[PDB]
Design an enzyme around this catalytic site. Structure first.
Site, PDB file in Angstrom:
ATOM      1  N   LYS A  22     -48.869  34.840  35.690  1.00  0.00           N
ATOM      2  CA  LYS A  22     -48.465  33.949  36.773  1.00  0.00           C
ATOM      3  C   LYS A  22     -49.015  34.475  38.096  1.00  0.00           C
ATOM      4  O   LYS A  22     -49.576  33.708  38.887  1.00  0.00           O
ATOM      5  CB  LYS A  22     -46.955  33.688  36.774  1.00  0.00           C
ATOM      6  CG  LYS A  22     -46.361  33.211  38.082  1.00  0.00           C
ATOM      7  CD  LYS A  22     -44.868  33.520  38.110  1.00  0.00           C
ATOM      8  CE  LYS A  22     -44.298  33.350  39.509  1.00  0.00           C
ATOM      9  NZ  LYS A  22     -44.948  34.274  40.488  1.00  0.00           N
ATOM     10  N   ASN A  23     -48.867  35.780  38.307  1.00  0.00           N
ATOM     11  CA  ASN A  23     -49.342  36.425  39.517  1.00  0.00           C
ATOM     12  C   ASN A  23     -50.846  36.652  39.682  1.00  0.00           C
ATOM     13  O   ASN A  23     -51.286  37.210  40.676  1.00  0.00           O
ATOM     14  CB  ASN A  23     -48.418  37.496  40.095  1.00  0.00           C
ATOM     15  CG  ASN A  23     -47.034  36.944  40.489  1.00  0.00           C
ATOM     16  OD1 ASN A  23     -46.873  35.745  40.766  1.00  0.00           O
ATOM     17  ND2 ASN A  23     -46.041  37.828  40.544  1.00  0.00           N
ATOM     18  N   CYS A 115     -35.928  35.070  52.714  1.00  0.00           N
ATOM     19  CA  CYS A 115     -35.923  35.029  51.250  1.00  0.00           C
ATOM     20  C   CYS A 115     -34.693  35.819  50.792  1.00  0.00           C
ATOM     21  O   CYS A 115     -34.352  36.814  51.429  1.00  0.00           O
ATOM     22  CB  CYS A 115     -37.234  35.583  50.620  1.00  0.00           C
ATOM     23  SG  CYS A 115     -37.247  35.672  48.801  1.00  0.00           S
ATOM     24  N   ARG A 120     -39.067  39.984  54.140  1.00  0.00           N
ATOM     25  CA  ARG A 120     -40.413  39.679  53.663  1.00  0.00           C
ATOM     26  C   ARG A 120     -41.459  39.289  54.705  1.00  0.00           C
ATOM     27  O   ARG A 120     -42.127  38.281  54.541  1.00  0.00           O
ATOM     28  CB  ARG A 120     -40.422  38.801  52.424  1.00  0.00           C
ATOM     29  CG  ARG A 120     -39.696  39.389  51.255  1.00  0.00           C
ATOM     30  CD  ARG A 120     -40.563  39.294  50.026  1.00  0.00           C
ATOM     31  NE  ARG A 120     -40.244  38.176  49.180  1.00  0.00           N
ATOM     32  CZ  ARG A 120     -41.019  37.696  48.209  1.00  0.00           C
ATOM     33  NH1 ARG A 120     -42.206  38.223  47.946  1.00  0.00           N
ATOM     34  NH2 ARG A 120     -40.576  36.692  47.450  1.00  0.00           N
ATOM     35  N   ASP A 305     -40.566  43.817  39.407  1.00  0.00           N
ATOM     36  CA  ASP A 305     -40.414  42.627  38.567  1.00  0.00           C
ATOM     37  C   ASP A 305     -39.787  42.909  37.223  1.00  0.00           C
ATOM     38  O   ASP A 305     -39.428  41.955  36.524  1.00  0.00           O
ATOM     39  CB  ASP A 305     -41.646  41.727  38.462  1.00  0.00           C
ATOM     40  CG  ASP A 305     -41.978  41.014  39.772  1.00  0.00           C
ATOM     41  OD1 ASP A 305     -41.081  40.844  40.625  1.00  0.00           O
ATOM     42  OD2 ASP A 305     -43.141  40.607  39.939  1.00  0.00           O
ATOM     43  N   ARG A 397     -39.888  28.548  37.369  1.00  0.00           N
ATOM     44  CA  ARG A 397     -40.976  28.926  38.265  1.00  0.00           C
ATOM     45  C   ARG A 397     -41.784  30.092  37.701  1.00  0.00           C
ATOM     46  O   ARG A 397     -43.010  30.105  37.865  1.00  0.00           O
ATOM     47  CB  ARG A 397     -40.523  29.240  39.687  1.00  0.00           C
ATOM     48  CG  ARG A 397     -39.952  28.121  40.500  1.00  0.00           C
ATOM     49  CD  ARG A 397     -39.412  28.684  41.813  1.00  0.00           C
ATOM     50  NE  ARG A 397     -40.446  29.371  42.582  1.00  0.00           N
ATOM     51  CZ  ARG A 397     -40.215  30.091  43.681  1.00  0.00           C
ATOM     52  NH1 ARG A 397     -38.972  30.218  44.128  1.00  0.00           N
ATOM     53  NH2 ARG A 397     -41.222  30.671  44.342  1.00  0.00           N
TER      54      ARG A 397
HETATM   55  C1  LIG Z   1     -46.747  35.679  44.259  1.00  0.00           C
HETATM   56  C2  LIG Z   1     -46.692  37.146  43.994  1.00  0.00           C
HETATM   57  O1  LIG Z   1     -47.639  37.693  43.471  1.00  0.00           O
HETATM   58  N1  LIG Z   1     -45.561  37.806  44.346  1.00  0.00           N
HETATM   59  C3  LIG Z   1     -45.422  39.210  44.087  1.00  0.00           C
HETATM   60  C4  LIG Z   1     -45.926  40.060  45.254  1.00  0.00           C
HETATM   61  O2  LIG Z   1     -45.224  39.712  46.408  1.00  0.00           O
HETATM   62  P1  LIG Z   1     -45.750  40.131  47.801  1.00  0.00           P
HETATM   63  O3  LIG Z   1     -44.917  39.406  48.706  1.00  0.00           O
HETATM   64  O4  LIG Z   1     -47.138  39.890  47.974  1.00  0.00           O
HETATM   65  O5  LIG Z   1     -45.412  41.677  47.801  1.00  0.00           O
HETATM   66  P2  LIG Z   1     -45.943  42.874  48.664  1.00  0.00           P
HETATM   67  O6  LIG Z   1     -46.680  42.300  49.769  1.00  0.00           O
HETATM   68  O7  LIG Z   1     -46.565  43.882  47.839  1.00  0.00           O
HETATM   69  O8  LIG Z   1     -44.588  43.400  49.185  1.00  0.00           O
HETATM   70  C5  LIG Z   1     -44.624  44.513  50.003  1.00  0.00           C
HETATM   71  C6  LIG Z   1     -43.348  45.056  50.579  1.00  0.00           C
HETATM   72  O9  LIG Z   1     -43.824  45.307  51.892  1.00  0.00           O
HETATM   73  C7  LIG Z   1     -43.318  44.371  52.866  1.00  0.00           C
HETATM   74  N2  LIG Z   1     -44.402  43.669  53.605  1.00  0.00           N
HETATM   75  C8  LIG Z   1     -45.300  42.825  53.011  1.00  0.00           C
HETATM   76  C9  LIG Z   1     -46.309  42.183  53.754  1.00  0.00           C
HETATM   77  C10 LIG Z   1     -46.391  42.413  55.133  1.00  0.00           C
HETATM   78  O10 LIG Z   1     -47.253  41.870  55.809  1.00  0.00           O
HETATM   79  N3  LIG Z   1     -45.496  43.261  55.749  1.00  0.00           N
HETATM   80  C11 LIG Z   1     -44.509  43.893  55.019  1.00  0.00           C
HETATM   81  O11 LIG Z   1     -43.722  44.654  55.606  1.00  0.00           O
HETATM   82  C12 LIG Z   1     -42.423  43.432  52.111  1.00  0.00           C
HETATM   83  O12 LIG Z   1     -41.302  43.163  52.863  1.00  0.00           O
HETATM   84  C13 LIG Z   1     -42.145  44.138  50.811  1.00  0.00           C
HETATM   85  O13 LIG Z   1     -40.899  44.845  50.956  1.00  0.00           O
HETATM   86  O14 LIG Z   1     -45.732  41.471  44.937  1.00  0.00           O
HETATM   87  C14 LIG Z   1     -44.380  41.826  44.605  1.00  0.00           C
HETATM   88  C15 LIG Z   1     -44.300  43.310  44.284  1.00  0.00           C
HETATM   89  O15 LIG Z   1     -45.090  43.544  43.160  1.00  0.00           O
HETATM   90  C16 LIG Z   1     -43.838  41.009  43.424  1.00  0.00           C
HETATM   91  O16 LIG Z   1     -42.522  41.318  43.113  1.00  0.00           O
HETATM   92  C17 LIG Z   1     -43.935  39.520  43.770  1.00  0.00           C
HETATM   93  O17 LIG Z   1     -43.433  38.766  42.728  1.00  0.00           O
HETATM   94  C18 LIG Z   1     -42.718  37.573  43.120  1.00  0.00           C
HETATM   95  C19 LIG Z   1     -41.220  37.896  43.153  1.00  0.00           C
HETATM   96  C20 LIG Z   1     -43.067  36.401  42.139  1.00  0.00           C
HETATM   97  O18 LIG Z   1     -43.081  36.597  40.918  1.00  0.00           O
HETATM   98  O19 LIG Z   1     -43.358  35.261  42.548  1.00  0.00           O
END
Ligand SMILES: CC(=O)N[C@H]1[C@@H](OP(=O)(O)OP(=O)(O)OC[C@H]2O[C@@H](n3ccc(=O)[nH]c3=O)[C@H](O)[C@@H]2O)O[C@H](CO)[C@@H](O)[C@@H]1O[C@H](C)C(=O)O
Length: 418
Positions: A22-23, A115, A120, A305, A397
């Protein structure tokens, strides 16, 4: 409001074929906006998230259709805006930003709001773009990006590890002038898959899977055909399903090198695991699982996840075990739900402390997380009696027909339209 009616206890055993990630499907569908020729993405899972992706693509002016494959024609993209109505139902939409500005010099995407699993922010996304020479402004809730001509390759060092931002910058760089170097990049298997899709289109990328990614801009991207990798989270979920039910299972269409951390934890819980080039076998030998200690972190460490799934494992395991969350600090909604089922647990800050019990009790529980909520369904399978999991649209989803797969494992599960 669809619901899952589950009858337990049930021993999960047999086989399952893993769907496409999915990802990986997600970022790739968004990266297609870069392609000037028609493109075909294979092995895409049938799930709500892909539908919303297609809907967005379509609004932008792309020609989209699907079955096992997704057909995308991004030649006529004429609108450059991901509207509030879409982004609100799926924060990943933010992914439209990069391709849009890298290719059309413009892009308007809705700023994602709150969220339920935690803070996020998308600061890294915006920041990375600015470094590539884009000008970004916030108006009416829209993050408006623009660039006179083309993007500028640059040396970008990342504050924190981010799967989302690494993909945004990586994608936008394929059409910039010169070389871009991303430092402290995310190593997620899905990022490797997206880079590989990009290369297939004519992009020049190296370092994918490591902390350093190098992109050499090119003037344009073509079309092509690409097969998405197997879903690691889906695979892990099924492995756990067998481990908590004292069963045995064989996962078909898998990619073992993608689950190091998870497989190791399973062994620690006392599981007998074997791997092939495209399969994974798990045998509990009639045994109850042993408690384990987990700590979530960016790839290749234990993934967030898989967190709720392991919390469930600990909850019916022998002994006491803890699970610490360092990626999504407040991703604990499942715990109170499991409590309604007879689970013994306490939450201290970002750590859940688990006290394993012999067996759970059916009850009415509520899904809220597209991945974590699958744990409620799993609990229903091994709990004593009848469990009703409400609001499964969340699960729709993130999982392709999870009832069918569980049923083929021996589960007593039903989807009702009440
Ligand atoms: C669609 C998709 O691929 N989503 C995935 C991805 O989210 P993402 O959002 O990109 O994850 P991050 O940016 O690695 O998350 C990073 C961490 O860092 C902070 N951060 C993120 C971006 C930013 O600009 N500034 C900032 O501070 C943030 O708050 C988080 O705590 O990565 C996550 C961790 O592996 C997954 O759990 C998530 O799955 C979901 C559930 C699903 O299946 O749909």
């Amino acid at each position: 409001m669809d619901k899952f009616r589950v009858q337990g206890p049930t021993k999960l055993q047999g086989e399952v074929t893993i769907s496409g990630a999915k990802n990986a499907a997600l970022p790739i569908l968004f990266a297609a906006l870069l392609a000037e020729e028609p493109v075909e993405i294979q092995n895409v899972p049938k799930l709500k998230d892909v539908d919303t992706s297609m809907k967005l693509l379509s609004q932008l002016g792309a020609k989209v259709e699907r079955x096992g494959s997704v057909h995308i024609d991004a030649r006529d993209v004429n609108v450059f805006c991901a509207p509030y109505d879409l982004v609100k139902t799926m924060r990943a939409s933010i992914w439209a930003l990069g391709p849009l500005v890298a290719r059309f010099g413009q892009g308007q995407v809705s700023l994602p709001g709150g969220c339920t699993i935690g803070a996020r922010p998308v600061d890294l996304h915006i920041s990375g773009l600015e470094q590539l020479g884009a000008t970004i402004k916030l108006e009416e809730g829209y993050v408006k990006a623009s660039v006179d001509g083309r993007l500028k390759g640059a040396h970008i060092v990342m504050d924190k590890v981010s799967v989302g931002a690494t993909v945004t910058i990586m994608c936008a760089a394929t059409l910039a002038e010169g070389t871009t170097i991303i430092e402290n990049a995310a190593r997620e298997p899905e990022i490797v898959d997206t880079a590989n899709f990009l290369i297939t289109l004519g992009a020049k990328i190296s370092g994918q899977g490591t902390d350093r990614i190098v992109i050499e801009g090119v003037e344009r991207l073509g079309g092509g055909v690409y097969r998405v990798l197997p879903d690691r989270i889906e695979t892990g979920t099924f492995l756990v399903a067998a481990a908590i039910s004292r069963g045995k299972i064989i996962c078909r269409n898998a990619q073992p090198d993608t689950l190091d951390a998870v497989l190791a934890k399973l062994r620690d819980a006392g599981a007998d695991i074997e791997v092939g080039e495209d399969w994974i076998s798990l045998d509990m030998h009639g045994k109850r699982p042993k408690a384990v200690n987990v700590r979530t972190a960016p790839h290749p460490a234990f993934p967030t996840d898989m967190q709720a799934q392991f919390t469930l494992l600990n909850l019916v395991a022998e002994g006491t075990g803890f699970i610490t969350e360092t990626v999504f600090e407040n991703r604990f909604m499942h715990v109170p739900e499991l409590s309604r089922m007879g689970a013994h647990a306490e939450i201290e800050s970002n750590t859940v402390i688990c006290h394993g019990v012999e067996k759970l009790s059916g009850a009415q529980v509520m899904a809220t997380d597209l991945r974590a909520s699958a744990s409620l369904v799993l609990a229903g399978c091994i709990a004593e009696g009848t469990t009703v999991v409400d609001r499964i649209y969340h699960i729709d989803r993130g999982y392709e027909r999870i009832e069918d797969k569980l049923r083929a494992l021996g589960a007593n599960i039903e989807r009702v339209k009440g």
